[PDB]
Paper text:
In the case of the glutaredoxin that is the focus of this study, glutaredoxin A from the cyanobacterium [name] [name] 6803 serves as the preferred electron donor for the 2-electron reduction of arsenate to arsenite, catalyzed by arsenate reductase. As part of the thioredoxin superfamily, glutaredoxin A shares the characteristic thioredoxin fold. The structure of the wild-type protein is comprised of the major protein secondary structure elements: four α-helical segments, and four mixed parallel: anti-parallel β-strands that form a single β-pleated sheet. Our random mutagenesis approach has yielded four new crystal structures of glutaredoxin A, one for each of the following variants: R27L, [name], A79S, and P84R.
Due to the location of Ala75, one might have predicted that changes in structure and function observed for the [name] and the A79S variants would be subtle. These replacements are located at the extreme C-terminus of the protein in α-helix 4, and both are exposed to the outside surface of the helix. Neither is involved in crystal packing interactions nor core packing interactions, and therefore, these positions are predicted to be highly tolerant of modification. Since ammonium sulfate is used in the crystallization medium of these glutaredoxin A crystals, there are two sulfate anions coordinated to the wild-type and to the mutated glutaredoxin A structures. Interestingly, the [name] mutation does not coordinate sulfate ions in its crystal structure. In the wild-type structure, sulfate #2 is 10.6 Å from the Cα atom of Ile75, while sulfate #1 is 35.2 Å distant. The large distance between the site of the mutation and the ligand binding site discounts any direct effect on sulfate binding. As there is no sulfate anion bound to the N-terminus, the His-tag of [name] is considerably more disordered that the other glutaredoxin structures that do coordinate sulfate. The same residues in the [name] structure without a coordinated sulfate anion show an average temperature factor of 32.6 Å2. While the elevated temperature factors can be explained by the lack of sulfate coordination, the rationale for the lack of this anion in this mutation is still unknown.
Residue numbers in the entry: -10 to 88
The structure:
Amino acid sequence: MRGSHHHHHHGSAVSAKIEIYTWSTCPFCMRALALLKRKGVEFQEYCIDGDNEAREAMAARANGKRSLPQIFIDDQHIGGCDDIYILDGAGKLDPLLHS
């Protein structure tokens, strides 16, 4: 297959799984989104506007928390908008996304 291929035993190529639960018009959710979008990372947004079930699903994963947003990286619970910004401020976010 013609091209410049990288070898290092990746086998099956997968990248970090990045997830965010949101309300579309939540100013905190929007701030969190801006941040990831700024990084250029690939992520999945679970926009649960008016969805009671999904909030419950969320809470199950988010340590009982129903506040928004809720962020996850490689199935690790990161937390809310606050949390991710603190991580970025400390130089800790990029190693997770990761680089």
